[PDB]
Design a protein around this ligand. Structure first.
Ligand SMILES: CCOc1cc(C(=O)N2CCC(N3CCN(C)CC3)CC2)ccc1Nc1ncc2c(n1)N(C1CCCC1)c1ccccc1C(=O)N2C
Length: 111
């Protein structure tokens, strides 16, 4: 089935995003947002479905995505949360944009 072929290619996108090359801008998305440690009393009012690369990895390694589109939806959700919660001039936003540049480019190049 070409459904798991695409998902295996998405595991490579995930490895690329977690890789040491992109760490200057990707590290805020390694683990979930700790709203209590960052004193974001606001975060879970606005972000109803948090997402991060480690949760995406957990779901991928557990075969929880039925197809590549579900994986892409979660990665983009992680980006959309960051754009939604933060003021557009914050530099977590620039960091998220640099990482999304990696994701969208490698996703489009899927055979
Ligand atoms: C597992 C460790 O976790 C964190 C630890 C610490 C920490 O105390 N030290 C102290 C000095 C830090 N410095 C200052 C800033 N410098 C750009 C780099 C060096 C290094 C580490 C800070 C943030 C963390 N984790 C996080 N995870 C998601 C988000 C997130 N931070 N940022 C920040 C990342 C950098 C700027 C924004 C957010 C902050 C507020 C609201 C939303 C978000 C948000 O959207 N994301 C995705």
């Amino acid at each position: 089935g070409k459904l798991s072929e695409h998902l295996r290619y998405c595991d490579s996108i995930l490895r690329e995003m977690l890789s040491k090359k992109h760490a200057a801008y990707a590290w805020p998305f390694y683990k979930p947002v700790d709203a209590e440690a960052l004193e974001l009393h606001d975060y879970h009012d606005i972000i109803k479905h948090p997402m991060d690369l480690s949760t995406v990895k957990r779901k991928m390694d557990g075969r929880e995505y039925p197809d590549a589109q579900g994986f892409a939806a979660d990665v983009r959700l992680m980006f959309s949360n960051c754009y939604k919660y933060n003021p557009p001039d914050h530099e977590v936003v620039a960091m998220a944009r640099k990482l999304q540049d990696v994701f969208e480019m490698r996703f489009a190049k899927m055979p």
